Design a protein around this ligand. Structure first.
Ligand SMILES: *[C@@H]1O[C@H](CO)[C@@H](O[C@@H]2O[C@H](CO)[C@@H](O[C@@H]3O[C@H](CO[C@H]4O[C@H](CO[C@H]5O[C@H](CO)[C@@H](O)[C@H](O)[C@@H]5O[C@H]5O[C@H](CO)[C@@H](O)[C@H](O)[C@@H]5O)[C@@H](O)[C@H](O[C@H]5O[C@H](CO)[C@@H](O)[C@H](O)[C@@H]5O)[C@@H]4O)[C@@H](O)[C@H](O[C@H]4O[C@H](CO)[C@@H](O)[C@H](O)[C@@H]4O[C@H]4O[C@H](CO)[C@@H](O)[C@H](O)[C@@H]4O[C@H]4O[C@H](CO)[C@@H](O)[C@H](O)[C@@H]4O)[C@@H]3O)[C@H](O)[C@H]2NC(C)=O)[C@H](O)[C@H]1NC(C)=O
Ligand code: POV
Ligand code: POV
Ligand code: NAG
Ligand code: NAG
Ligand code: NAG
Lengths: 156, 73, 52, 250, 245, 218, 219
């Protein structure tokens, strides 16, 4: 999967007229602040992403990071109608250390950004169907915990 | 009775409740047999606990018979 | 077939998959076929010298 | 697909220029890629979490700025199987390489060019040494194309407008299965057919036929642990097994 | 052989000595091992490439320069198997420790001296040690060995070896392979009390016991090592009972 | 925090050694532990205290193979001969888990029950039917293939004999005794009078007593 | 020691591990290569892979790493780390699924003449043409092709330490017998330049299988 993260860093601003019209920079991810958005419901111990592609910084402070990961997530299997079964198999995402008091998680915007995308995005140019599993639905919503006001996840 | 017991931190000389007046001292060296030495268990007992091949027990009937080997009764 | 299927069924104990229920159904059905064939052969090889 | 490949990059860095006569006549230079700019061109269709090459070897630089980089890699790509004609199947396994650190307006992924007769021609194929290539014992390479793919549905700003893809169309060598799966089962099913020549005065018709079916069940067992549990097609061998098991039941 | 060991390295670094009076009585300091010189004590008889320890623990440094490093390790050693009497076998598996950097003119590997006596054995907590389940430890010696084909140099001259002579618990095999095959192959002598006529089913019983022996051979082949120096005992017995059938 | 109060809650995959007791398998209860302590310091330098008497399972995913019955965490201090004022601490968390015995019941036990029940049946199969050996020895073959299944499913432990193993060996000895007595019965049935005259005790017991001792039979 | 500390500080002060150890860019640095086979771990006759545990002995001179022992307390040898000095990029060309180069950054031995002796371990997983024609009575010939990856014989020349590998510390396998073993140095010229050879040392091992497992279990 590619995660599609976007945030605003007020420190990464500049006037492009002062820098030969540079309106966007590609900067190694290790050089900017990035939220610790990780897969919590992993079955291995690999929370963080694998490929640290370099972020996209705009002169407004808008930082877009589309990193890649081979994620191994845990999902409960319902063994009642196997092999004629349908599985849920979510992927939970949140910042490991930053909480609601610090970051506000939202949904990603569509290509022509006007409205949020509340589903997993699939690019037909790059998508290998499994052959054993048909994807019927692929939503995405934010989930909270009434006992924990500091919790907020974006589950897929 | 006044026994020495490792059931406290630090070790204390506390009197045993009614029923136990035998001050025991078990010893055996575990994975840290070298850097530290033999383990030291102390306290109260109504009867002297059993002994295994690797242990080193000593039970008494008097007060404070079971001090840490680096102390005296 | 049970052996075949051994390495392909989740090892969870919250339920039995319909596939293993079907295999156990067929297995018990074959067992009862064996029992009743034994009964049929017993009846067929019966005679007055042994049975009234 | 598991492959040992050598990526051969080539690009110009105007900052790595020098007049060789100003220095001594240094015609070439070796530099570790942890000192120079490197295009992190990654295998996007990888199964393991291994997007990069395995040995970040040195880059060779010329005074004009022409940098070459031949890093070796061991990739584990995801290529799905077409089990339809198994074990007579041919597969079309792809290695898809992208540049996810820059957009198409910042770098342009192209294929390497070469020369024969004073003409430049692109290398639209995987390179394979014809002497130093040890053919795999199960797969034969028929075709080995290479393509630069543009996705015009996407915008050049973005890392999904670019792709250099290397395709392996490989044919299976069907000998282990022909010698251990197909021939024995065929002959054993022929035995089942021949069971009709056995007189009923010999209590051996049903024994013969049902033992043949047991052998076929054993072969089905061996087959079931050779293919993925996919459902886009019934493998030819499983097709034949169902056909022959049904015929023997009949 | 896979082991979880706590190996205790001890040495002296004259550079890390101090006078306690100048430091309020401090006689003991913990310094991470990533900051200090260590002897590159490694497992040479490893199958993987993990020569080093797993957790680089801190090094207790004493005022006299004494260093106590107790790093835990997880080692996948190599010990060849002796199949001859498998599964009633005992294996002699060794852990060979030497420095892959320094030689004998530089470091002198030796064993610990507790109470002036050398610790020529692997230490095992008799209370907090869980026996494996298939392997029982009988002997556990340790000796300093020298390869005399080499010199006081060459970095492989000296080596501390710890041995683990382990006797197998052949119970899974007994009540899953041995006893079943024995009871099943004992049936071929019952064909001698069956009638030699249609319905007696002599060959039925015999050849079916052969079939069962074949299945047991397939089951054993999933359990025996792939070495070709000796024939194990259970495979030998399978061949014997198949010849008998 | 501004007071220096630090909170660090990192993740870990703990692969801990647990004394597994396969004696009641698959109806087995375990008490797997996780012992934690400071490696290089003692209680006089670095003290560790447990946050709570028992672990936090408020976000515990149900396993599907194990039920967590009890779970608790104890702090221990240990004294040595070194020194009578330096305790060496540890916190040992233990989790008591009961296995859910459905997978192994359905996949390992019921088939063995069928094989046993069918071995107790070759005795209703007459000998004029030349099929007693067929039936008995084919049950034995089915049980051998199922022995393959079992070895593939259940553990290869040698710590002790589990229940699955006791039952499998009981069933196998049952089938073997069935086959042996079946051979005896076939030998008596095909006992020619030319070479064997029937004793008198056998006629008194089997022809004259037991038949009447039965009522359910035909 | 104060002497060795001062020495290692003065040897690496202006030293760049990125430049070859040569007085002039035209000259080459000869690296004496030697393979020490320790155990043959595996032979995958399907994937055509041979897995070995080896030590890759390498000797070469670094003119920048010299000193007079008289000025350093009589020291004539030290044990510098390998990431601190220039090393040759010897790669296993016929690598299958393992590591191409050396990844164990073991310390190296350095004399006062600049002579270095680096002997790091490696798990070679090589690609071997396997001949299943007389299995299990087969005789394989499996090679390890080694060469400098980024340098040519004009810049870095390799030379085998001996005509054939070192099997003095070879653990017997139990399923393979080594009949013969030799190592050859080759050079290859290309149309680019005639004065530039590309070098490779290829060690091969002729291993005969012990056919007993497959006789008693399969025949
Ligand atoms: C699964 O596997 C597991 C591992 O394999 C296995 O774990 C074992 O379980 C058993 C039982 O659960 C454990 O046995 C217990 O161990 C306890 C810990 O011993 C440590 O600590 C005590 C000190 O205890 C004080 O401090 C600690 C830590 O701060 C607190 O947690 C305690 O509550 C207690 O605090 C009081 O006192 C403090 C001052 O000291 C005050 O500050 C505080 O406010 C409280 O007032 C030490 O003494 C121990 O040292 C001894 O043992 C170590 C080794 O363990 C030796 O090295 C050392 O030399 C000493 O010999 C140790 O460090 C024990 O506390 C506990 O003891 C009670 O039970 C035993 C017998 O069971 C009695 O002899 C003892 O007198 C205690 O009885 C009192 O407590 C029990 C309940 O604990 C009451 O039922 C009883 O009526 C009595 O009550 C009085 O005191 C209570 C305070 O304890 C008080 O609450 C009551 O109200 C009443 O007034 C016992 O020994 C064992 O450690 C586990 N092992 C491991 C490795 O985890 C598990 O069982 C397995 N499960 C299954 C199902 O198989
Ligand atoms: C059971 C009790 C047997 C009662 C006797 C019997 O029927 O022997 C039957 C064997 O039938 C068998 O199957 C014997 C099984 C022995 C197998 C070897 C295991 C014991 C070996 C260690 C022992 C038939 O045997 P027989 O050849 O007919 O014997 C003549 C009987 N007569 C003396 C009456 C003529
Ligand atoms: C099926 C076997 C039935 C059977 O053996 O019946 C017989 C023995 O019956 C018994 O002696 C009963 C033995 C136990 C049967 C299984 C019980 C499982 C619980 C019943 O007696 P019979 O004289 O053998 O047959 C009478 C006619 N009938 C079989 C049609 C009833
Ligand atoms: C390179 O340097 C030499 C020496 O000054 C000079 O003659 C020559 O013109 C230079 N070449 C270029 C392209 O600048
Ligand atoms: C990329 O280009 C498209 C098309 O012009 C535009 O809609 C989009 O805003 C651009 N993205 C960025 C980050 O500039
Ligand atoms: C240690 O330091 C003190 C000063 O605090 C000094 O008096 C004493 O002599 C020193 N001890 C040694 C052994 O040098």
């Amino acid at each position: 999967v590619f995660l599609n993260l976007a945030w605003t860093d007020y420190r990464l601003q500049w006037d492009p007229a002062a820098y030969e019209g540079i309106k966007d920079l590609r900067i190694p991810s290790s050089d900017v602040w990035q939220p610790d958005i990780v897969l919590m419901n992993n079955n291995d111990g690999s929370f963080e992403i694998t490929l640290h592609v370099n972020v996209l910084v705009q002169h407004t402070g808008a930082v877009s990071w589309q990193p890649s990961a081979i994620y191994r997530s845990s999902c409960t299997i319902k063994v009642m109608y196997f092999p004629f079964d349908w599985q849920n198999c979510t992927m939970v995402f949140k910042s490991y250390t930053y909480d609601t008091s610090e970051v506000t998680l939202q949904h990603a915007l569509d290509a022509k950004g006007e409205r949020e995308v509340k589903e997993i995005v699939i690019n037909k140019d790059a998508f290998t169907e499994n052959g054993q599993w048909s994807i019927e639905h692929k939503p995405s919503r934010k989930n909270w915990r009434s006992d924990d006001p500091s919790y907020e996840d974006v589950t897929f | 009775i006044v026994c020495h017991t490792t059931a406290t931190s630090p070790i204390s000389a506390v009197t045993c409740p009614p029923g136990e007046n035998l001050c025991y001292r078990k010893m055996w060296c575990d994975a840290f047999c070298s850097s530290r030495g033999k383990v030291v268990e102390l306290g109260c007992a109504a009867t002297c606990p059993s002994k295994k091949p690797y242990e080193e027990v000593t039970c008494c009937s008097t007060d404070k018979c079971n001090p840490h080997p680096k102390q005296r009764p | 077939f049970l052996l075949l299927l051994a390495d392909k069924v989740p090892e969870t104990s919250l339920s039995v998959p319909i596939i293993i229920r079907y295999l156990m159904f067929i297995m018990i059905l074959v067992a009862f076929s064996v029992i009743l064939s034994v009964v049929v052969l017993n009846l067929h090889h019966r005679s007055p010298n042994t049975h009234t | 697909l598991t492959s040992n490949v050598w990526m051969d990059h080539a690009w110009y860095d105007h900052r790595l220029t020098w007049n060789a006569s100003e220095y001594s006549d240094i015609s070439i230079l070796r530099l570790p890629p942890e000192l120079v700019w490197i295009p992190d061109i990654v295998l996007q269709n990888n199964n393991d979490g291994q997007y990069h090459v395995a040995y970040f070897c040195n880059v060779l630089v010329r005074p004009n700025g022409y940098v070459t980089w031949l890093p070796p890699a061991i990739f584990r790509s995801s290529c799905p199987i077409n089990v339809l004609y198994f074990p007579f199947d041919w597969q079309n396994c792809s290695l898809k390489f992208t540049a996810l650190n820059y957009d198409a307006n910042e770098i342009t992924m192209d294929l390497m060019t070469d020369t024969i007769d004073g003409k430049d021609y692109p290398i639209e194929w995987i390179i394979i040494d014809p002497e130093a290539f040890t053919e795999n014992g199960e797969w034969e390479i028929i075709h080995k194309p290479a393509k630069k793919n543009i996705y015009p549905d996407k915008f050049p700003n973005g890392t999904n407008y670019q792709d250099v893809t290397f395709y392996l169309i490989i044919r299976r060598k069907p000998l282990f299965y022909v010698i251990n799966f197909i021939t024995p089962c065929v002959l054993i099913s022929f035995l089942a057919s021949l069971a009709f020549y056995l007189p009923a005065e010999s209590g051996e018709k049903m024994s013969t036929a049902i033992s043949v079916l047991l052998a076929q069940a054993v072969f089905l067992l061996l087959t079931s642990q050779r293919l993925p549990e996919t459902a886009l097609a019934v493998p030819l061998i499983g097709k034949y097994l169902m056909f022959i098991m049904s015929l023997v039941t009949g | 052989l896979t082991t979880n060991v706590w190996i205790e390295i001890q040495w002296n670094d004259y550079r890390l000595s101090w006078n306690t009076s100048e430091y309020e009585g401090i006689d003991l300091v913990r310094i991470p091992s990533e900051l200090l010189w260590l002897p590159d004590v490694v497992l040479e008889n490893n199958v993987d490439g993990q020569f080093e320890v797993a957790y680089y623990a801190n090094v207790l440094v004493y005022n006299d320069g004494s260093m106590y490093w107790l790093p835990p390790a997880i080692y996948r050693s190599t010990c060849p198997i002796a199949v001859t009497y498998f599964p009633f076998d005992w294996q002699n598996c060794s852990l060979v420790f030497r420095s892959q950097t320094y030689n004998a003119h530089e470091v002198n590997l030796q064993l610990s001296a507790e109470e002036g006596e050398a610790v020529e054995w692997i230490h095992i907590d008799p209370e907090d040690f869980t026996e494996n389940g298939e392997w029982t430890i009988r002997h556990r010696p340790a000796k300093k060995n020298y390869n005399w084909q080499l010199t006081k140099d060459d970095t492989d001259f000296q080596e501390i070896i710890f041995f683990l002579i382990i006797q197998r618990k052949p119970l899974f095999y007994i009540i899953n392979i041995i006893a079943p095959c024995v009871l099943i192959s004992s049936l071929v002598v019952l064909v001698y009390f069956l009638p030699a006529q249609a319905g007696g089913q002599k060959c039925t019983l015999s050849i079916s016991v052969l079939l069962a022996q074949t299945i047991f051979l397939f089951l054993i082949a999933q359990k025996v090592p792939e070495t070709s120096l000796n024939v194990p005992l259970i495979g030998k017995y399978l061949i014997f009972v198949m010849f008998v059938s | 925090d501004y007071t220096g109060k630090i909170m660090w809650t990192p993740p870990a995959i703990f692969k801990s050694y647990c004394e597994i007791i396969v004696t009641h398998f698959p109806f087995d209860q375990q008490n797997c532990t996780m012992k934690l302590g400071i490696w290089t310091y003692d209680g006089t330098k670095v003290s560790i205290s447990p946050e709570s008497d028992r672990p936090d399972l408020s976000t515990f995913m149900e396993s599907g193979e194990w039920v967590m019955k009890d779970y608790r965490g104890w702090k221990h201090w240990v004294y040595y001969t070194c020194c009578p004022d330096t305790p060496y601490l540890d916190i040992t968390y233990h989790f008591i888990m009961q296995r859910i015995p459905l997978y192994f019941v359905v996949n390992v036990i019921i088939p063995c029950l069928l094989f046993s029940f069918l071995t107790g049946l070759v005795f209703y199969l007459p000998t004029d039917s030349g099929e007693k050996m067929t039936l008995s020895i084919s049950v034995l073959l089915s049980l051998t293939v199922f022995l393959l299944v079992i070895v593939e499913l259940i553990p290869s432990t040698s710590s002790a004999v589990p229940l699955i193993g006791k039952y499998m060996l009981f069933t196998m000895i049952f089938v073997i005794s069935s086959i042996i007595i079946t051979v005896v019965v076939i030998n008596t049935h095909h006992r020619s009078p030319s070479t064997h005259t029937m004793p008198q005790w056998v006629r008194k017991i089997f022809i004259d007593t037991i038949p009447n001792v039965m009522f359910f039979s035909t | 020691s104060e002497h060795e500390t001062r020495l290692v500080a003065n040897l690496l002060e202006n030293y760049n591990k990125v430049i070859r150890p040569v007085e002039h860019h035209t000259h080459f640095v000869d690296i004496t290569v030697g393979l020490q086979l320790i155990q043959l771990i595996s032979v995958d006759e399907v994937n055509q892979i041979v897995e070995t545990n080896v030590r890759l002995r390498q000797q070469w001179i670094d003119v920048r790493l010299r000193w007079n022992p008289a000025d350093y307390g009589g020291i004539k040898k030290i044990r510098l780390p390998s990431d601190d000095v220039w090393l040759p990029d010897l790669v296993l060309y016929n690598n299958a699924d393992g590591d191409f180069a050396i990844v164990h950054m073991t310390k190296l031995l350095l004399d006062y003449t600049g002579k270095i002796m680096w002997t790091p371990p490696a798990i070679f997983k090589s690609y071997c043409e396997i001949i299943v024609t007389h299995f299990p009575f087969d005789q394989q010939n499996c090679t390890m092709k080694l060469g400098i990856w980024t340098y040519d014989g004009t810049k870095v020349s390799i030379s085998p330490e001996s005509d054939r590998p070192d099997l003095s510390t070879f653990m017997e396998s139990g399923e393979w017998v080594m009949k013969d073993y030799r190592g050859w140095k080759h050079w290859v010229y290309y149309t680019c330049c005639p004065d530039t050879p590309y070098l490779d040392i290829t060690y091969h091992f002729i291993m005969q299988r012990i056919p007993l497992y497959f006789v008693v279990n399969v025949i």
